[PDB]
Structure formats: structure tokens, C-alpha cells
Amino acid sequence: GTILIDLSPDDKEFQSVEEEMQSTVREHRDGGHAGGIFNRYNILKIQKVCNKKLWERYTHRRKEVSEENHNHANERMLFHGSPFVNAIIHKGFDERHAYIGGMFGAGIYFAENSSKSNQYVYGIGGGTGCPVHKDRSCYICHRQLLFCRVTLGKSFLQFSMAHSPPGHHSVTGRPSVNGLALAEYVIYRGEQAYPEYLITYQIMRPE
Ligand SMILES: O=c1[nH]c2cc(Br)ccc2n2cccc12
Ligand SMILES: [Zn+2]
């Protein structure tokens, strides 16, 4: 049921998605080990992901959360990187996309920093890197990220599939050492995220 629609680079919607991608790159404490060494991306394509069934699944859960939280879904746009991006956009988020060993428990993880999600494109810790060259810092191979609509509801703040903490709908991982890191978030129900944009890109080698 999924259709992908290409956005033109001249479309303001392409341009606002690209700007969120580029502007939320940061340096990482692994010195690039997981995701590669770069300061910016070459964006190759941005597609809108359309699936009526998955969208309705998302909005149904969104209303349930809103009604549990004084009519406030606390909806964000967040990045998600995964070797399973193709199953996600076709069949939706579920248990198979959860991070069993995650430091906030076995939920599905999202990030404000696109470069954090980039570290997961080839798996946990960047796995063995790109399939072609076995390079976590490959500048040639095309990578993909999702830019997702996520319902946080009442989020449990951690300074630093399972269930979220009693009385909450998500967990927020607040950056507490690295003053430049943005927040990361975890949801415990696949229905609390919708993959809105599929972004195809390369990381760029700094000059
Ligand atoms: O975009 C992300 N994808 C992930 C995929 C797996 Br699988 C495990 C963890 C993350 N993760 C943690 C922070 C951000 C992300
Ligand atoms: Zn490669």
C-alpha cells in the first residue's frame, strides 16, 4: 500500500526537510567510528511516504495518547536510521525495529540529530559499514534515513517490546555531559511513529 512521491528540490517541503537534515549534524564522541567522518550531507533524493493504512494506524494511536494527556499528542518530527528502512516504509514500525539492548529499554529509538540516526543506517554501532566496501565512513554508497512523525505524549525524562514507564507514553533521553547533543526519544508502540519522508544521501568528506 506504500507509494513514494519524489519531491522537487524547488519545493519548499523538500527544502525544509533538507535544512533539518543538514542543520542537526553534530560531532560524535566516537570520532566518527559508527557513522563516519563528516560535517554535512549530499542529499540525493527526498520522497514522501504515503500509506493510508499506516497513517490511519498512527492517527488512531495519536488520538488515544492525546486524550490521555489533556488533548496534547506532543508530536515531534524526528530522525530514524535502520537497516530495516524498507520494511518500515512498507509495513510500519513494529517490535522488529526495537533496540533490545538500548539504554532506555527495548523500544524504538529516534533522534533530533540526524547524525545520531546516521550512526544506525548500517546497524548498531554502524555494524560492518556499507555492504559494498565494509566502510562505516563510506563516502560513495547511498544511505537512507527516515524523517518521522512521532507521538511522545507524556514523556519520562531521563538525564544521561518493553512498556514505557507507568503513566507515560515515551522516554526522553536528555543529553547531560555533551553540551552540544540534542535529545533522543524512545517509544514502545510502533503505532506512535509514521515514516513521513525517506531521505537518500551520502555523507561528505570534509575538505
Ligand atoms: O535513528 C536511530 N535508529 C536506531 C536504530 C536502532 Br536498531 C537502535 C538505536 C537507534 N537509535 C538510537 C538513537 C537514534 C537511533
Ligand atoms: Zn560503500
Q: What is the resolution of this structure in A?
A: 1.9
Question: How far is 52 from 203, CA to CA, in rounded Å?
Answer: 32
Distance of CA 193 to the CA centre of its chain: 10
Total number of residues shown for the chain: 207
Decide: 121 and 198 in contact? Cβ < 8 Å: no
| Assigned C-alpha cell, 23 | 542543520
Which atom of ligand 1 is closest in space to residue 84's alpha carbon?
7
CA angle 162, 167, 171 (to 5 degrees): 50
Domains, the chain = 1-207 (3.90.228.10)
Ligand 1 touching residue 120 (CB < 6 A): yes
Give the Å distance between the CA of 82 and the centre of ligand 1.
7
Nearest to 193 by CA among 86, 74, 103, 100: 74
> DSSP string spanning the chain?
--EEEEPPTTSHHHHHHHHHHHHT----TTTTTTT-S-S-EEEEEEEEEE-HHHHHHHHHHHHHHHHTTTT---EEEEEE--TTHHHHHHH---GGGS-TT-TT-SSEEEESSHHHHHTTTTSGGGTT--TTT--TT-SSS-EEEEEEEEE--SEEEEE------TT-SEEEEE-SS-TTPPPEEEES-GGGEEEEEEEEEEEPPP-
Does the annotation list 138 as a binding residue?
Answer: yes
R_g of the chain, CA atoms, integer Å: 16
| Assigned C-alpha cell, 171 | 522516554
Question: How far is 14 from 177, CA to CA, in rounded Å?
Answer: 34
Decide: 2 and 89 in contact? Cβ < 8 Å: yes
Question: How far is 65 from 201, CA to CA, in rounded Å?
Answer: 33
Pocket-testing residue among 28, 99, 103, 185, ligand 1, by greatest number of atoms within 8 A of Cβ: 99
Question: How far is 41 from 199, CA to CA, in rounded Å?
Answer: 11
Does the annotation list 130 as a binding residue?
Answer: yes
> What is the pairing mode between strands 155-159 and 170-174?
parallel
| Assigned C-alpha cell, 37 | 567522518
Ligand nearest to the backbone CA of 175: 1
Provide the edge-to-edge strand list for the sheet that holds 108-111. 3-6, 41-50, 193-203, 143-151, 75-80, 108-111, 184-187, 170-174, 155-159
Which atom of ligand 1 is closest in space to residue 184's alpha carbon?
13
Residues with Cβ within 8 Å of 64's Cβ and at least 6 positions away in sequence, in order, are none
Residue 153 half-sphere exposure, CB side, CA atoms within 13 Å?
Answer: 26
Q: Could you identify the residue written with the cell 496534547?
A: 72
Question: How far is 148 from 91, CA to CA, in rounded Å?
Answer: 14
| Assigned C-alpha cell, 126 | 554502524
**PDB experimental method:** X-ray
Pocket-testing residue among 114, 119, 143, ligand 1, by greatest number of atoms within 8 A of Cβ: 119
